[PDB]
Amino acid sequence: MNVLVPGIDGMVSAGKFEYSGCCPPDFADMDECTLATSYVGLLPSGPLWDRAKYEAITTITATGNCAACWTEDHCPTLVDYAVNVGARLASVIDMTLWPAVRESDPFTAVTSTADWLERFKWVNCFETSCRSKALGEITPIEYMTECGPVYVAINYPPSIKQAFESALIKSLERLSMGIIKNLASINFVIEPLKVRVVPLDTTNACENETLCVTFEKTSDFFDGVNQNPCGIPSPVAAYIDRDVMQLPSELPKYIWPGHMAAECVVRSLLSHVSRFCVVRTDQTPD
Amino acid sequence: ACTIQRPEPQALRDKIATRFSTNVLGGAEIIPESNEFYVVTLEYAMQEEFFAFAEQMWREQDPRYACCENLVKMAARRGVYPKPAQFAQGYVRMTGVPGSALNQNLRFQFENQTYEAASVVPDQLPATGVLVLRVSAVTPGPSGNIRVTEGSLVTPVPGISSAVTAYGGNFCGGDDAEECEPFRTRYLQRLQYEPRLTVEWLKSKAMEWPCVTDVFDLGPNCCSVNALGEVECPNNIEFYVLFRDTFDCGLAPQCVVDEITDWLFGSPQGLGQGEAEFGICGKVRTATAVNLDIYLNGLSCATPAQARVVEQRITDFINRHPPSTNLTVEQLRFIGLQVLGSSFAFDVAIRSPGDASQSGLRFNACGDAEIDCDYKACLNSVQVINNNVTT
Amino acid sequence: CTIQRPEPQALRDKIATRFSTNVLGGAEIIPESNEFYVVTLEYAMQEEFFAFAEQMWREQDPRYACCENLVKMAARRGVYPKPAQFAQGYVRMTGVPGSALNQNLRFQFENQTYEAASVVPDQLPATGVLVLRVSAVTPGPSGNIRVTEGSLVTPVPGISSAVTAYGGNFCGGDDAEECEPFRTRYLQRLQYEPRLTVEWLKSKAMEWPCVTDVFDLGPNCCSVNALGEVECPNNIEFYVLFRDTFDCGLAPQCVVDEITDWLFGSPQGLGQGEAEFGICGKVRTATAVNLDIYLNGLSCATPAQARVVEQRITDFINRHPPSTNLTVEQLRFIGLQVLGSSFAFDVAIRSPGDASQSGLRFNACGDAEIDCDYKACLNSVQVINNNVTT
């Protein structure tokens, strides 16, 4: 039979089409060098233009940005200006139009990750001092004090914050499509965060007094976000070291922002179940 | 606030100048006043517009910034459409001599509102001589909601009684169209992330029951704590509903809400026989009225227009107040003070009718009217006591 | 408010005026001068910008994106095309009890090879009968043939080389999807949200091969809904029928056990299957109860009318839900709808040989009373005459 693959509707069978080849060129094919020399064709033709148009030469300087190469016997003409216009459009598109499209989709946003979260009205349940009592005696980012527990707000580095926010957006986008709250679907929703749910009970269950679940790490690296239209993203670490950040010693040695975010999502999803329990277990990088 | 980060203007202007010299002038910079200087500046100006154009086309597709037209087009692609205008509906009783032929174009009138039959009229009156029809307002809008019992035909027909009466209830359900801004918030709420959407889904669904006007969640006073001093979170679903346009003060008897609960959750509840999903248990509540008298002071020095609007605003605020919520003098004072001016001498007081005691009402020291659970503050009368000033 | 793509002429004039006023101080643009070529090049650069922008913004729209750009931005959300499926069916084999079996059984019915799909026990059952679920080896619609006799591909000691398929039914085959049908059902899925309504569970069951009807527990069943110390219902169970494959549409327990495991998962109560987390359930079968029906007076009706009444009654009982009374009134109404209200009709229900069958009782009114896990199966319909007329 077929081999099922995870999907928003559960386990389904996947496939592929045959290549068509009718795709318009993307931003990737937009090369500065080819585009610049191209406008030499927009000029007229005649004895005043043939020689100038024939000797057009273009080279890439230090930081890309193809520029015309003036040899020892260059003859100034409008053709130089035409090439200059070519460089302009290649540059302006990259600076102006590419970011607009790049930031328009939750699965490719880079610079506006924080803004996107505000569109989803996302609020973390581990930072409010009046958190729900069911969230455990002491959360991973709380240290006990005589006047009850107290939490500490972490200032993540730039790269880890960008990766974590990007992963959160992807999962939230998937959940807005509606799902059936079963184990197979939930794992797929939160898989970008690199977390997997796993029940503790292995027998029949359905009669015991409590149902317990725990969260396991599927990997020790978020998948970063790539600015350029071509190339793979750069992975970044998902954990944070307590000592390196100079945080109170009472906190756990390693802190996983992804696991905390995933825990909040699942807890809200399965609130209607009256015997749902979470038993978090300490995890360390390999 | 910009989404397309724009480098500093000085950095940009240097970039264009450097590019121009390298390509056209062969490495030499520009003379301060010449054609090359002016064309460079014009090029910078065009770049500014290009940045705006790209950002605008990004702005014009985001739900919270798109135009009033593009917004609906995006909504149509996710199964969300604006609500159209509704027509008031109800039943009407008719009596006449049996046998006389009927007509399809007959229409009625109840307090200047004209209603027409909304169903295929039978050929002639039945033997018993009494007929029941389904009617809808001739014109849409909230004006079709009225609390009346007696009417009369506008187009007399031989053999049919000159007067007709409606059923024990009344006509309601008419509503006006939906504007752009209310639609935008509704669409965004669907796209956003919120816990326990099942509660929200039921709350929205209950608004489709006839005669329902408002849906209110459990009030703050409805919270309870067990003997252990720990707040208790129930696993059921409950909320209030009001019928401001059908019942006195918007409170309905128990029997009416019981029918709604059965339809929403089923009978027995939880087996998915109702509109709710499988394994969902809940109950829809009602409330009891407590009367209140409100006295305004220091309003004589204000112009008559100010007095009229201030009284109107307070009356509206009390009417739509939720059940099981405290009513404090601060809220009313702020509302009026927001119009008169922060320096005005304005004061308000709250007292019960005849200074008698009532169930579920207690006055704290500060003057608030604390209200227990399943109790709504129903306005009784607004009186502006009189003094003499400015003479 | 809205600003859109400017037209060509309205765009060139904007550049020419801007260039003239700021660089030449109001001077006119004389055609065929150096400024003329500068202006036109500037306009071209600006138009190519808008044209490219419109081209790219189309690709983000699923209703117009090319096929290769649609498989992505759809696999991200968990929607994928569908490959060719496989036909399925049921088979039966017999042999000497205790013989050692193998997990690589293969069957060749007629030019088609089928392989075992369920787990085959280590040894043949005591009764010497085994029923398996098999699937074709080559996907496609061609696997839906209807044959009843087949043979084991490779002989096995102690097991006969002849096998049979229940009713010769083989369903499930299909072909791969295409680009256009995939574009639909995706942008249609964007407008749809599941909710775990009892209808959804009911619909999901029918996706099992050779399943036709599905009913909730009948009136004569006292269900249990708690399954633990909980305040809201937690359990759900329902029946199934295989009318076109098994006799009377009732399947042996060997099959319904497989459905329950897949639908609700194993272990249950942890959302390991297609059901919600924290929901337990069970799918059950029923045992047949044979009945005989005697129609009185039909012989005096026209032959065409007689056949219709017989066929309608047979169909109605076949579709009857399990564990539900089969009252006389229902049968009588079927006769009156066709024979006319003025006809001298009469029906009666009696057991074969007037014997006693477990789970069957007759009430005072003459109806048939059936207990849980039992169904009314027609055994024979006969016409008798004991009156005079005409």
mmCIF file of C-alpha atoms in Angstrom, chain A residues 83-286:
data_model
loop_
_atom_site.group_PDB
_atom_site.id
_atom_site.type_symbol
_atom_site.label_atom_id
_atom_site.label_comp_id
_atom_site.label_asym_id
_atom_site.label_seq_id
_atom_site.Cartn_x
_atom_site.Cartn_y
_atom_site.Cartn_z
ATOM 1 C CA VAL A 83 23.832 51.099 -18.733
ATOM 2 C CA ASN A 84 23.579 53.288 -15.632
ATOM 3 C CA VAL A 85 19.782 53.123 -15.813
ATOM 4 C CA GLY A 86 20.045 49.349 -16.050
ATOM 5 C CA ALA A 87 21.976 49.156 -12.795
ATOM 6 C CA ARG A 88 19.376 51.403 -11.166
ATOM 7 C CA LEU A 89 16.339 49.198 -11.792
ATOM 8 C CA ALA A 90 18.159 46.046 -10.697
ATOM 9 C CA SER A 91 19.110 47.796 -7.459
ATOM 10 C CA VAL A 92 15.765 49.472 -6.754
ATOM 11 C CA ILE A 93 13.800 46.246 -7.282
ATOM 12 C CA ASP A 94 16.006 44.426 -4.781
ATOM 13 C CA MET A 95 15.780 47.231 -2.212
ATOM 14 C CA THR A 96 12.122 48.141 -2.790
ATOM 15 C CA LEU A 97 9.915 45.450 -4.353
ATOM 16 C CA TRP A 98 11.564 42.246 -3.107
ATOM 17 C CA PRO A 99 11.165 43.105 0.613
ATOM 18 C CA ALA A 100 7.496 43.963 0.054
ATOM 19 C CA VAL A 101 6.688 40.490 -1.280
ATOM 20 C CA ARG A 102 9.058 38.773 1.154
ATOM 21 C CA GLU A 103 7.226 40.262 4.152
ATOM 22 C CA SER A 104 3.712 39.559 2.825
ATOM 23 C CA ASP A 105 3.582 35.850 3.757
ATOM 24 C CA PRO A 106 3.967 34.297 7.236
ATOM 25 C CA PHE A 107 6.138 31.515 5.779
ATOM 26 C CA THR A 108 8.772 33.931 4.425
ATOM 27 C CA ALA A 109 8.674 36.983 6.720
ATOM 28 C CA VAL A 110 12.096 38.055 7.990
ATOM 29 C CA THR A 111 12.208 41.633 9.267
ATOM 30 C CA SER A 112 8.550 41.946 10.351
ATOM 31 C CA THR A 113 8.327 38.854 12.565
ATOM 32 C CA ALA A 114 7.434 40.949 15.615
ATOM 33 C CA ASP A 115 4.726 42.841 13.726
ATOM 34 C CA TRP A 116 3.128 39.608 12.512
ATOM 35 C CA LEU A 117 2.717 38.347 16.079
ATOM 36 C CA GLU A 118 0.770 41.511 16.896
ATOM 37 C CA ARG A 119 -1.555 40.602 14.019
ATOM 38 C CA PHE A 120 -2.282 37.258 15.709
ATOM 39 C CA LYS A 121 -2.770 38.911 19.130
ATOM 40 C CA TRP A 122 -0.375 36.365 20.627
ATOM 41 C CA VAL A 123 0.186 36.599 24.391
ATOM 42 C CA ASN A 124 2.519 34.345 26.365
ATOM 43 C CA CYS A 125 1.099 32.769 29.519
ATOM 44 C CA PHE A 126 4.485 32.471 31.272
ATOM 45 C CA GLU A 127 5.162 36.217 31.682
ATOM 46 C CA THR A 128 2.028 37.463 33.480
ATOM 47 C CA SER A 129 2.436 37.474 37.253
ATOM 48 C CA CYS A 130 -1.194 36.322 37.574
ATOM 49 C CA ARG A 131 -0.748 33.096 35.638
ATOM 50 C CA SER A 132 -3.188 30.215 35.921
ATOM 51 C CA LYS A 133 -2.465 28.033 38.937
ATOM 52 C CA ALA A 134 -2.801 24.883 36.812
ATOM 53 C CA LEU A 135 0.413 25.781 34.945
ATOM 54 C CA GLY A 136 2.521 24.086 37.632
ATOM 55 C CA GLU A 137 4.000 24.972 40.999
ATOM 56 C CA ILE A 138 7.064 26.706 39.508
ATOM 57 C CA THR A 139 7.453 27.453 35.806
ATOM 58 C CA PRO A 140 10.856 27.097 34.105
ATOM 59 C CA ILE A 141 11.442 30.874 34.262
ATOM 60 C CA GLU A 142 10.391 31.425 37.884
ATOM 61 C CA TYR A 143 12.502 31.341 41.044
ATOM 62 C CA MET A 144 10.863 30.969 44.438
ATOM 63 C CA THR A 145 10.693 34.000 46.728
ATOM 64 C CA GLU A 146 9.280 34.394 50.225
ATOM 65 C CA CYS A 147 6.398 36.417 48.745
ATOM 66 C CA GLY A 148 5.435 33.678 46.305
ATOM 67 C CA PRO A 149 7.079 32.823 42.992
ATOM 68 C CA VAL A 150 8.608 35.538 40.822
ATOM 69 C CA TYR A 151 9.345 35.392 37.095
ATOM 70 C CA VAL A 152 12.192 36.966 35.125
ATOM 71 C CA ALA A 153 11.841 38.445 31.636
ATOM 72 C CA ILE A 154 14.634 37.232 29.352
ATOM 73 C CA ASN A 155 16.215 39.462 26.700
ATOM 74 C CA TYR A 156 17.022 36.960 23.972
ATOM 75 C CA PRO A 157 19.841 37.653 21.502
ATOM 76 C CA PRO A 158 18.866 38.920 18.041
ATOM 77 C CA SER A 159 19.415 35.752 16.015
ATOM 78 C CA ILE A 160 17.592 33.423 18.416
ATOM 79 C CA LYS A 161 14.690 35.851 18.803
ATOM 80 C CA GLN A 162 14.298 36.140 15.028
ATOM 81 C CA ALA A 163 14.337 32.368 14.539
ATOM 82 C CA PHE A 164 11.952 31.655 17.418
ATOM 83 C CA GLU A 165 9.427 34.266 16.290
ATOM 84 C CA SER A 166 9.590 32.999 12.706
ATOM 85 C CA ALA A 167 8.864 29.443 13.842
ATOM 86 C CA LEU A 168 5.956 30.591 16.010
ATOM 87 C CA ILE A 169 4.337 32.445 13.101
ATOM 88 C CA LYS A 170 4.414 29.344 10.899
ATOM 89 C CA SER A 171 2.665 27.190 13.502
ATOM 90 C CA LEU A 172 0.028 29.837 14.225
ATOM 91 C CA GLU A 173 -0.726 30.205 10.511
ATOM 92 C CA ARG A 174 -1.301 26.457 10.192
ATOM 93 C CA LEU A 175 -3.647 26.352 13.190
ATOM 94 C CA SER A 176 -5.935 29.089 11.850
ATOM 95 C CA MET A 177 -7.155 26.684 9.139
ATOM 96 C CA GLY A 178 -9.008 24.524 11.671
ATOM 97 C CA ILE A 179 -8.000 21.021 12.765
ATOM 98 C CA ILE A 180 -9.452 17.944 14.442
ATOM 99 C CA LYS A 181 -7.879 17.746 17.885
ATOM 100 C CA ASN A 182 -6.149 14.365 17.602
ATOM 101 C CA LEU A 183 -2.549 13.495 18.383
ATOM 102 C CA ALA A 184 -1.472 13.140 14.746
ATOM 103 C CA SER A 185 -2.730 16.584 13.712
ATOM 104 C CA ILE A 186 -1.473 18.469 16.773
ATOM 105 C CA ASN A 187 2.097 17.253 16.276
ATOM 106 C CA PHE A 188 2.018 18.576 12.707
ATOM 107 C CA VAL A 189 0.753 21.985 13.840
ATOM 108 C CA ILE A 190 3.583 22.560 16.328
ATOM 109 C CA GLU A 191 6.326 20.711 14.435
ATOM 110 C CA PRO A 192 8.008 23.953 13.237
ATOM 111 C CA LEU A 193 8.857 24.603 16.891
ATOM 112 C CA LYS A 194 10.721 21.253 16.939
ATOM 113 C CA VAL A 195 8.571 19.741 19.697
ATOM 114 C CA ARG A 196 6.596 16.493 19.795
ATOM 115 C CA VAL A 197 3.893 15.388 22.220
ATOM 116 C CA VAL A 198 3.985 11.833 23.565
ATOM 117 C CA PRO A 199 1.557 10.271 26.080
ATOM 118 C CA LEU A 200 3.022 8.562 29.122
ATOM 119 C CA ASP A 201 0.416 5.797 29.322
ATOM 120 C CA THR A 202 1.024 2.788 27.081
ATOM 121 C CA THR A 203 -1.835 0.503 28.182
ATOM 122 C CA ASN A 204 -5.488 0.825 27.160
ATOM 123 C CA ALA A 205 -6.189 3.839 29.388
ATOM 124 C CA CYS A 206 -9.570 5.639 29.080
ATOM 125 C CA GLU A 207 -10.408 4.623 32.678
ATOM 126 C CA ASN A 208 -7.477 5.920 34.721
ATOM 127 C CA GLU A 209 -7.968 9.104 36.724
ATOM 128 C CA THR A 210 -5.539 11.259 34.710
ATOM 129 C CA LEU A 211 -4.105 11.500 31.204
ATOM 130 C CA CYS A 212 -0.476 12.637 31.097
ATOM 131 C CA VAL A 213 1.632 13.947 28.213
ATOM 132 C CA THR A 214 5.195 15.192 27.867
ATOM 133 C CA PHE A 215 7.159 17.208 25.319
ATOM 134 C CA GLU A 216 10.241 15.873 23.523
ATOM 135 C CA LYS A 217 12.755 17.708 21.360
ATOM 136 C CA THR A 218 12.821 16.643 17.712
ATOM 137 C CA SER A 219 16.030 18.627 17.090
ATOM 138 C CA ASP A 220 18.430 21.083 18.718
ATOM 139 C CA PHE A 221 18.276 23.734 15.982
ATOM 140 C CA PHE A 222 15.633 26.073 14.644
ATOM 141 C CA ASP A 223 15.585 26.522 10.874
ATOM 142 C CA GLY A 224 16.670 30.110 10.306
ATOM 143 C CA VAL A 225 15.276 32.640 7.830
ATOM 144 C CA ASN A 226 17.068 33.536 4.596
ATOM 145 C CA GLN A 227 17.033 37.115 3.327
ATOM 146 C CA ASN A 228 18.240 36.327 -0.185
ATOM 147 C CA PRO A 229 15.819 34.802 -2.724
ATOM 148 C CA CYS A 230 18.262 31.915 -3.301
ATOM 149 C CA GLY A 231 20.107 29.679 -0.868
ATOM 150 C CA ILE A 232 19.241 27.682 2.238
ATOM 151 C CA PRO A 233 18.561 29.283 5.647
ATOM 152 C CA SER A 234 21.180 29.182 8.386
ATOM 153 C CA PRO A 235 20.180 27.063 11.417
ATOM 154 C CA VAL A 236 20.471 28.531 14.907
ATOM 155 C CA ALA A 237 20.463 27.020 18.378
ATOM 156 C CA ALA A 238 17.106 26.616 20.106
ATOM 157 C CA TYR A 239 18.381 26.684 23.707
ATOM 158 C CA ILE A 240 19.824 29.394 25.948
ATOM 159 C CA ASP A 241 22.480 28.941 28.628
ATOM 160 C CA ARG A 242 21.658 30.327 32.067
ATOM 161 C CA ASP A 243 25.221 31.107 33.145
ATOM 162 C CA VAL A 244 26.174 32.795 29.867
ATOM 163 C CA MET A 245 23.216 35.176 30.166
ATOM 164 C CA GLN A 246 23.959 35.963 33.848
ATOM 165 C CA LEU A 247 20.556 34.930 35.193
ATOM 166 C CA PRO A 248 19.578 33.827 38.713
ATOM 167 C CA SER A 249 20.973 30.429 39.653
ATOM 168 C CA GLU A 250 17.549 29.086 40.667
ATOM 169 C CA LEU A 251 16.574 28.773 37.001
ATOM 170 C CA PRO A 252 17.144 25.527 35.078
ATOM 171 C CA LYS A 253 20.497 25.129 33.369
ATOM 172 C CA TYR A 254 19.000 25.254 29.856
ATOM 173 C CA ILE A 255 15.937 27.203 28.706
ATOM 174 C CA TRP A 256 13.942 26.283 25.588
ATOM 175 C CA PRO A 257 11.643 29.098 24.385
ATOM 176 C CA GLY A 258 10.063 26.816 21.792
ATOM 177 C CA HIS A 259 8.918 24.251 24.347
ATOM 178 C CA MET A 260 7.284 26.921 26.510
ATOM 179 C CA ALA A 261 5.383 28.360 23.545
ATOM 180 C CA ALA A 262 4.269 24.907 22.392
ATOM 181 C CA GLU A 263 3.034 24.030 25.883
ATOM 182 C CA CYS A 264 0.740 27.070 25.933
ATOM 183 C CA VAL A 265 -0.817 26.225 22.563
ATOM 184 C CA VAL A 266 -1.665 22.622 23.458
ATOM 185 C CA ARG A 267 -3.022 23.531 26.896
ATOM 186 C CA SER A 268 -5.503 25.943 25.315
ATOM 187 C CA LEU A 269 -6.468 23.448 22.605
ATOM 188 C CA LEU A 270 -7.416 20.634 25.011
ATOM 189 C CA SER A 271 -8.906 22.723 27.825
ATOM 190 C CA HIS A 272 -12.340 21.085 27.585
ATOM 191 C CA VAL A 273 -10.821 17.779 28.747
ATOM 192 C CA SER A 274 -11.106 17.706 32.535
ATOM 193 C CA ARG A 275 -8.297 15.211 33.287
ATOM 194 C CA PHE A 276 -5.424 16.511 31.151
ATOM 195 C CA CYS A 277 -2.015 16.748 32.829
ATOM 196 C CA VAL A 278 1.453 17.834 31.705
ATOM 197 C CA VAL A 279 4.672 16.442 33.192
ATOM 198 C CA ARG A 280 7.599 18.420 31.803
ATOM 199 C CA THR A 281 10.980 16.673 31.876
ATOM 200 C CA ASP A 282 14.410 18.285 31.829
ATOM 201 C CA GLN A 283 16.215 18.060 28.489
ATOM 202 C CA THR A 284 19.778 18.849 27.463
ATOM 203 C CA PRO A 285 21.576 19.363 24.144
ATOM 204 C CA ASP A 286 23.391 16.394 22.649
#
